[PDB]
């Protein structure tokens, strides 16, 4: 799972940025 825990860690990174972003959606 050398991949898929590489990616793990960047999916939060990412989910992270995707959460900031909505989170100021109203």
Known sequence: ???DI???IGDLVKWII????KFTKK
């Open 1 to 3: 799972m050398a991949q």
């Open 6 to 8: 590489i990616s793990t």
């Open 18 to 21: 995707d959460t900031v972003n």
